[PDB]
């Protein structure tokens, strides 16, 4: 603590006073991982490996929950043409949990395949499938041209070019109504200013990459609107109480201790917030319980020392630190110099029962100085001498002796 004073002040000498070198830290030991255990596997191969797919105007929605997935086919082993992600990192797919999954499978040409993204406008982008600006997910593409294509063209997959107004996102258009740009009624058939909006793709294997179809499955991720769907796949550890450790609970992190909860709980609730707007409580995924979270590493380290022209003895002060449980130094932790004050415990000063005039203040009425083979002592600040005179009505004191005193006051201008 002599060397910690010179680091913050950027001086090679130490002046006379009380300084704050650093703050009290608690290093975490283990990491509690509590993840749910499901014996079911997630059928991702139904939507990925199927022969027949839907079109861009009406797709097949899929909700997958209450299983255990494998994300290594999206990331680790990837024999795919183009894989992209936006909000969630592809490295971090094994970590996070989300609200629900929407698997949207459609077959799209290679010229129009770049319009699946937030903030796009085009033929396929406007009137079929839109994404909002806050949308989170990944785009997986693979070249399908050696399988479902045809030499004379594929008329099975269809798309819709024409619509009157802009379509709301996450909505399928089943309407067969003829687009009417004129004042003449179309009556369901072609005519003047009457076009049939539903057309067929140009797909052939023999031409370039604009005519090659791609298999695009877009996953929808929404964050913190609900508890966990599948889980992030990992291992699982035990549940440690009354010890400061790192937390990872369904992707949400934290540092603190786990204590019992006397407050009532909500059965639909994963976690909640205190008056400090941080997570004070969490629910176990496997069984339904609630435990309180109190954070760690609180308080500060202050030093009390005379200057370098006097001695090297440095007294250290913890403020707001519980001293029953106890910086890189272990050397003063043997004890027996510890005196308990209001602000904390003072290590390195011997408490005396006398009352003197001190120099370096601490607080709460208890001060400290350097007095006499000499050491730092701590005591209570003196009020001065005590004067006791008996008084009556018939006595007076008139001074018979005078002196002239000269005092000096300094005011900066």
């Amino acid at each position, epitope marked *: 603590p002599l060397s910690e004073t010179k680091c913050t002040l950027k001086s090679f000498t130490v002046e006379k006073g009380i300084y704050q070198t650093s703050n009290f830290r608690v290093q975490p030991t*283990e990491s509690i991982v509590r993840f749910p255990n499901i014996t079911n596997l997630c059928p991702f191969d139904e939507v990925f490996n199927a022969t027949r797919f839907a079109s861009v105007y009406a797709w097949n929605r899929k909700r997958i929950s209450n299983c255990v997935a494998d994300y290594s086919v999206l990331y680790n082993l990837a024999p795919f043409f183009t894989f992209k992600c936006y909000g969630v990192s592809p490295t971090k797919l094994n970590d996070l949990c989300f609200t629900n999954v929407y698997a949207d499978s459609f077959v799209i040409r290679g010229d129009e395949v770049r319009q699946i993204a937030p903030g796009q406008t085009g033929n396929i982008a406007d009137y079929n499938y839109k994404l909002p600006d806050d949308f989170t997910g990944c785009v997986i593409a693979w070249n399908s041209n050696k399988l479902d294509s045809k030499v004379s063209g594929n008329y099975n997959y269809l798309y819709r070019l024409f619509r009157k107004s802009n379509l709301k996102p996450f909505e399928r258009d089943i309407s067969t109504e003829i687009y009417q740009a004129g004042n003449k009624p179309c009556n369901g058939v072609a005519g003047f200013n009457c076009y049939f909006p539903l057309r067929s793709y140009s797909f052939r294997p023999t031409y370039g990459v604009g005519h090659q179809p791609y298999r695009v499955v877009v996953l929808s991720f929404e964050l913190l609107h609900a508890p966990a769907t599948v889980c992030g796949p990992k291992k699982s550890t*035990n549940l440690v109480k*009354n010890k400061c450790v790192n937390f990872n609970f369904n992707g949400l992190k934290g540092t603190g201790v786990l204590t*019992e*909860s006397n407050k009532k*709980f909500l059965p639909f609730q994963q976690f909640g917030r205190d008056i400090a707007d941080t997570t004070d409580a969490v629910r*176990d995924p496997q*069984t339904l*319980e609630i435990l309180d979270i109190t954070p760690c590493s609180f308080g500060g380290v202050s030093v009390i020392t005379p200057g370098t022209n006097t001695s090297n003895q440095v007294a250290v002060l913890y403020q707001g630190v519980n001293c029953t449980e106890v910086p890189t130094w272990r050397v003063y932790s043997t004890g027996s110099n510890v005196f308990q004050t209001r602000a904390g415990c003072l290590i390195g000063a011997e408490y005396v029962n006398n009352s003197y005039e001190c120099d370096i203040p601490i607080g709460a009425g208890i001060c400290a100085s350097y007095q006499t083979s000499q050491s730092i002592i701590a005591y209570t600040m003196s009020l001065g001498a005590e004067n006791s005179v008996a008084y009556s009505n018939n006595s007076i004191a008139i001074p018979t002796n005078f002196t002239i005193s000269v005092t000096t006051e300094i005011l900066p201008v």
Partner: antibody
Amino acid sequence: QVQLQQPGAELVRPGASVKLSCKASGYSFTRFWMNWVKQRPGQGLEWIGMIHPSDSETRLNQKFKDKATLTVDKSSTTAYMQLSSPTSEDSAVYYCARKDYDYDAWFAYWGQGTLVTVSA
Amino acid sequence: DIVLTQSPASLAVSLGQRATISCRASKSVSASVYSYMHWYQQKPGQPPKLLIYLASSLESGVPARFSGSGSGTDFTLNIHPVEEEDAATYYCHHSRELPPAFGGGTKLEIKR
């Protein structure tokens, strides 16, 4: 199979040091905490101390302060308990247990038992 | 802390009856809707064994004649039907507050 092993008997003089052994097998030693209990005949069970083996931090009873010293060995996966200056009332039957966690923490398994006789 | 005291010290129950042995608590062990209590049964020459956790539940491998109930500071361990292998000392334990304490204990006898 998880089984905790202890020696049967240990002879120690009063005023000397007491060293005991609890061998852990079948589980990770730094993952699960260890507990030491004390059983005198006719009195029942009394609780000595509990130690986190990874941090080497001890939790002791108020009456049992400075009599017992808890230390661990993570290389051999063997927990130790060091008693200082035993008396005639300190001779008892000692167990060690594995503390498993599911909300309220139970004691899943137990050791073979150790009878410590203090005499010269 | 929480001091557990069981009454009486010894109880002799004949075969076929119901044994009522209570573990009384000085403070409330109920928090989060679930109380913190365990039950131990110690045969002589052997370490004690775990029976009932959280009270409302029963450990697998323990037979169905060992049951318990109660809420708050008043718990009740009901032993029925009484068999000759059930004579042993009964204990109760709270893990809630540090430092943990142990109960006084109650030994069950067979009246023949």
